[PDB]
Design a protein around this ligand. Sequence first.
Ligand SMILES: [Zn+2]
Ligand SMILES: [Zn+2]
Length: 416
Amino acid sequence: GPSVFLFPPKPKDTLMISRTPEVTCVVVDVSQEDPEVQFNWYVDGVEVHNAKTKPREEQFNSKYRVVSVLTVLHQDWLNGKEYKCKVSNKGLPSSIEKTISKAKGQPREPQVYTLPPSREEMTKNQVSLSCAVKGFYPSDIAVEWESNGQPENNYKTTPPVLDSDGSFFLVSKLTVDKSRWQQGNVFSCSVMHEALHNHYTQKSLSLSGPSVFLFPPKPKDTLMISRTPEVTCVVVDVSQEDPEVQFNWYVDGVEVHNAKTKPREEQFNSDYRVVSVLTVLHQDWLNGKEYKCKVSNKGLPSSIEKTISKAKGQPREPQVYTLPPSREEMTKNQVSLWCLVKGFYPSDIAVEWESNGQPENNYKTTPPVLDSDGSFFLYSKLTVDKSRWQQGNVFSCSVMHEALHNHYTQKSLSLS
Ligand SMILES: [Zn+2]
Ligand SMILES: [Zn+2]
């Protein structure tokens, strides 16, 4: 069955007026018995004939991909015009049309702050320089570093993360040799976002069909031995005409019988979802046992098996470092406290915040981000009133991860 994806321009092409933003239309799983693939393109419903259609690519499975690319105008894309790819191919019945546009809503301007390395990181050979960007909308953004006119390429940026006020934040982490930091070198975080002046700013930093899903347990369940980690097998789009749905569960190939199936849950389209939940022992999950859910139903041809397990590889202990606000943030009502956690494997982690023995719930965390050494890092951002920060109140970042002692650490952060 041939499918259609439509991808938006890359953010930095849409933000720099000298580059050529393009939307790409991609047809996957084109059988060899049947191209040709016809592309029609619409801008706000007006055909446009300029699109360029590449020759068909081989996939790893002997069916073809066909990509059509439409360059779009810096203004039109930012002014939120709609690009419609229609795809006509015999052995598709009819036509698949996808529409894309930029996200709607008043743009918001990012606040960009650079944050130095934590004193605790000043014993390593390398040190981490941060660029918090927050308060931006929409989420399209490109971040880059430089020093002294030269690209600094040793950086990883988190994807944008929705915050409580409907705006996004991310953090960018540039890794440098400490001597360079310690010698005075000047480092700049280059942000491009539509709602900046000239879409550009720079801040400097220098020494002061029924389908099956199988979900893994929640990380915090897997890391505190007093909770009950569980795998979840979900059958989706079950026809009213055909349950019953039977579940079979295997732990490294041995059937177990301790799974609890729920009653069918109504979906938004009048087919059903069935969920079976299998508790797992803390020591089995961390030790790498494989959980197989087999699903059987008459709306299927025979069976669907999914296998999940914990990611394989030598666990790596995280380094947890708290960062106080940027000085430039101190002119706000509310201020950002940072927990950088880095150098952890596998990616399964939980972060939380507390002060004075009470949970602080006004925080978002980034997803784990793959670093270049194969470890993961993220940041967590707690936003507190500034009076609390300047009164000297003490904040703790709690980090749960298999490779810590007891699977837990806390770092404090208070006014210097
Ligand atoms: Zn512009
Ligand atoms: Zn344990």
